[PDB]
Write an enzyme that holds these catalytic residues in place. Structure first.
Site, PDB file in Angstrom:
ATOM      1  N   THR A  16       0.832  -1.245   0.000  1.00 37.24           N
ATOM      2  CA  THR A  16       0.000   0.000   0.000  1.00 37.24           C
ATOM      3  C   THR A  16       0.869   1.299   0.000  1.00 37.24           C
ATOM      4  OG1 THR A  16      -0.321   0.131   2.450  1.00 37.24           O
ATOM      5  CG2 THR A  16      -1.883  -1.230   1.215  1.00 37.24           C
ATOM      6  N   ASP A  39       9.139  -7.727 -28.041  1.00 39.72           N
ATOM      7  CA  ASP A  39      10.223  -6.786 -27.755  1.00 39.72           C
ATOM      8  C   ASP A  39      11.406  -7.091 -28.686  1.00 39.72           C
ATOM      9  OD1 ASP A  39      11.831  -4.797 -26.550  1.00 39.72           O
ATOM     10  OD2 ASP A  39      11.341  -5.389 -24.467  1.00 39.72           O
ATOM     11  N   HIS A  69      16.770  -5.287 -23.955  1.00 35.19           N
ATOM     12  CA  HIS A  69      15.598  -4.614 -23.538  1.00 35.19           C
ATOM     13  C   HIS A  69      14.420  -5.582 -23.398  1.00 35.19           C
ATOM     14  CE1 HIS A  69      12.508  -1.356 -24.258  1.00 35.19           C
ATOM     15  NE2 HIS A  69      13.315  -0.801 -23.366  1.00 35.19           N
ATOM     16  N   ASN A 161       7.350   7.378 -23.424  1.00 37.73           N
ATOM     17  CA  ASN A 161       8.253   8.167 -22.618  1.00 37.73           C
ATOM     18  C   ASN A 161       8.375   9.570 -23.159  1.00 37.73           C
ATOM     19  OD1 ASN A 161       9.075   5.754 -21.097  1.00 37.73           O
ATOM     20  ND2 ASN A 161      10.127   5.202 -23.004  1.00 37.73           N
ATOM     21  N   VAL A 177      -7.048  -1.946 -24.545  1.00 43.91           N
ATOM     22  CA  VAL A 177      -5.929  -2.563 -23.820  1.00 43.91           C
ATOM     23  C   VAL A 177      -5.478  -1.768 -22.609  1.00 43.91           C
ATOM     24  CG1 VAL A 177      -5.281  -3.508 -26.000  1.00 43.91           C
ATOM     25  CG2 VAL A 177      -4.028  -1.557 -25.104  1.00 43.91           C
ATOM     26  N   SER A 224       8.042   1.352 -20.646  1.00 39.91           N
ATOM     27  CA  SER A 224       8.081  -0.018 -21.097  1.00 39.91           C
ATOM     28  C   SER A 224       8.813  -0.917 -20.112  1.00 39.91           C
ATOM     29  CB  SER A 224       8.639  -0.152 -22.518  1.00 39.91           C
ATOM     30  OG  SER A 224      10.050  -0.070 -22.565  1.00 39.91           O
ATOM     31  N   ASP A 260      -2.282   7.720  -4.860  1.00 36.99           N
ATOM     32  CA  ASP A 260      -0.924   7.718  -4.291  1.00 36.99           C
ATOM     33  C   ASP A 260      -0.046   8.746  -4.959  1.00 36.99           C
ATOM     34  OD1 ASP A 260      -0.958   5.874  -2.239  1.00 36.99           O
ATOM     35  OD2 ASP A 260      -0.194   4.231  -3.474  1.00 36.99           O
TER      36      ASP A 260
END
Length: 279
Positions: A16, A39, A69, A161, A177, A224, A260
């Site tokens: 949490t 990938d 990656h 990004n 998705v 990613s 959060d």
């Protein structure tokens, strides 16, 4: 189960709160779900995968991962030490060359491959695909991730990004998705992380330690790198019987940590992925 001095990302999804360093989870740990890491490929021979990774498809001369990656992201999905789902099967699909680039033509094939190839793999518990990639908007790719989704494969895509709204990026902008934003360890949206209505969850995306080519292990940033936590987490949850693939995003999102994160623009969800494991 309870892995100590775990990566912060792993320890966060079992928490949490920020600032613990123990990853708590059911020891089922994903046994019998599959994950398609789409990938640059996986080093299946990394000891961290314990012979659970294979390369099943490549659109290039080699299956071998020259980048790392894909190996990284596969590690976060399911490496024994750095991975969410410590007993998932992993299925590498190399749709990106060793400089991380891919024609969309290829990528789409890759997606359509998974939606069939899953009928060759044994995944009673369910199937996940971690699309550890994206580019600019294209309905062809979007619709591929939707088809893949439709087919009963929980798709986790990275939001990107670019610190932009992720409606301009595919397959992030596909409605159907699970688009994943990146959080950093002090529980802020990561500086680089795309955002918007079209996000569905955040995951740990900053300074994420996982497996890498050549038996090594490095820590890199990216949304990613967050995608696989969620993918991993879906594979965890499907194995626990908590949801199917077609509802996993909505399950995960309902069970997240609400409100959060800081630095979350207005309009984006404040959800951080959580495994809800009571130990």
């Amino acid at each position: 189960a309870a892995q100590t001095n775990a990566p912060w990302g792993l320890a966060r999804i079992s928490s949490t709160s920020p600032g613990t360093s123990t990853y708590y989870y059911d020891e089922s740990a994903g046994q019998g779900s599959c994950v398609y890491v789409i990938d640059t490929g996986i080093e299946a021979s990394h000891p961290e995968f314990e012979g659970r990774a294979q390369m099943v498809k490549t659109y290039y001369y080699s299956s071998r991962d020259g980048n790392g990656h894909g190996t990284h992201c596969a590690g976060t999905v399911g490496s024994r030490t750095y991975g969410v789902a410590k007993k998932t099967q992993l299925f590498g699909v190399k749709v990106l060359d060793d400089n991380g680039s891919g024609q969309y033509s290829t990528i789409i094939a890759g997606m359509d491959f998974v939606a069939s190839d899953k009928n060759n793999r044994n995944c009673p518990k369910g199937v996940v695909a971690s699309l550890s990639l994206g580019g600019g908007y294209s309905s062809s790719v979007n619709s591929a991730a939707a088809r893949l989704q439709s087919s009963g494969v929980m798709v986790a895509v990275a939001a990107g990004n670019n610190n932009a709204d992720a409606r301009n990026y595919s397959p992030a902008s596909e409605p159907s998705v699970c688009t994943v934003g990146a959080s950093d360890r002090y529980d802020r949206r990561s500086s680089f992380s795309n955002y918007g209505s079209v996000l569905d969850i955040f995951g740990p995306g900053t300074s994420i330690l996982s497996t890498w080519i050549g038996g090594s292990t490095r820590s890199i940033s990216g949304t990613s790198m967050a995608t696989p936590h969620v993918a991993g987490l879906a594979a965890y949850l499907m194995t626990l019987g908590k949801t199917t693939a077609a509802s996993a995003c909505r399950y995960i999102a309902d069970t997240a940590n609400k409100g959060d994160l800081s630095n979350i623009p207005f309009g984006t969800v404040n959800l951080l992925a959580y495994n809800n494991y009571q130990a």
